[PDB]
Amino acid sequence: SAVQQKLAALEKSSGGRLGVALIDTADNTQVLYRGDERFPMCSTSKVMAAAAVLKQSETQKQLLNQPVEIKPADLVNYNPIAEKHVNGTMTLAELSAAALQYSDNTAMNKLIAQLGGPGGVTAFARAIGDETFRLDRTEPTLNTAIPGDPRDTTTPRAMAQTLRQLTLGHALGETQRAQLVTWLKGNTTGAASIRAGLPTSWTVGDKTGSGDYGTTNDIAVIWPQGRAPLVLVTYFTQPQQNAESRRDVLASAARIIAEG
């Protein structure tokens, strides 16, 4: 198709490997580019951890208000919110928001702990029908993004379908889904990624991810004005371990998709 020619050209110009999945919920049509290849998820995996805790709260009604200690030993490499609460507590709701909206890595590790380890996050993916997602490590090592390494990867197709189910579908209860959507819409890290390629009137909720090998990711739910929502996943990774992030590639991919 025309869009896939332009995405292929974008990929060639970038020197990296680009994976795109679009689901248009208006007719459940999909646009895929390397849709079944594995990519390192990096921080886009935080959506699955947050959703898994939200799923637990459907039975444990007070779970999101449970205070969790933040100790100095809990802090890893990037903890913009958790650092503000060292030797204090954050609720699981506050940790989920920090993980999603600020990409706080300590917050993610607390969510993983709450779920019983990376196996508990992966279990939730399996429980909602995602047989592709795998979380193997905690922060920060899940971001190593080594070429060919299957750890901590998913495919664009799988993540788009799963993000659709979590936010627009009914994999979660109504209160939990609304909370997830509110969190994604309040993301602070996405201004230069998918959002930058889309009309400024469209509402976007997204989760970015970045890692080694110049890995630059964004997954988004998009509500265009007067139009059915879209789910867009853009993964990008590069051959050099020290490569710089390329958020512009995600913006350009989104712009190419938005042309259709």
Residue 51's φ and ψ, nearest 5 degrees, are -65, -35
Three-state SS for 92? Answer: helix
Contact (CB, 8 A) for 168 and 231: yes
Three-state SS for 168? Answer: coil
Contact (CB, 8 A) for 82 and 74: yes
Whole-Å CA distances, 108 to 74, 160, 176: 11, 21, 18
Phi-psi region of 77 (alpha: psi -120 to 50; beta: other; left: phi over 0): alpha
CATH of the domain at 69: 3.40.710.10
Report the catalytic residues. Answer: 43
Q: How was this structure determined?
A: X-ray
Contact (CB, 8 A) for 140 and 226: no
Beta strands, E only, the chain: 17-24, 29-33, 39-40, 67-70, 88-91, 153-154, 203-211, 215-223, 230-237
Tokens found for residue 79: 């903890």
Domain count, the chain: 1
For residue 233, what are the β-bridge partners?
21, 219
22 Cβ contact partners less than 8 Å away, ≥ 6 residues apart: 30, 31, 32, 160, 230, 231, 232, 233, 257
Bridge-based pairing of strands 29-33 and 67-70 is: unpaired
* CA–CA separation, 189 and 100 (whole Å): 9
Tokens found for residue 60: 């444990």
Tokens found for residue 251: 């913006």
Contact (CB, 8 A) for 10 and 147: no
Q: Amino acid identity of 99? A: A
The data reach a resolution, in angstroms, of: 1.7
Domain that holds residue 135: 2-259
What is the arrangement of strands in the sheet containing 203-211, beginning at the earlier edge strand?
29-33, 17-24, 230-237, 215-223, 203-211
Bridge-based pairing of strands 230-237 and 17-24 is: antiparallel
* CA–CA separation, 92 and 77 (whole Å): 20
Tokens found for residue 183: 């969190």
DSSP 8-state code for residue 39: E
Tokens found for residue 9: 């050209």
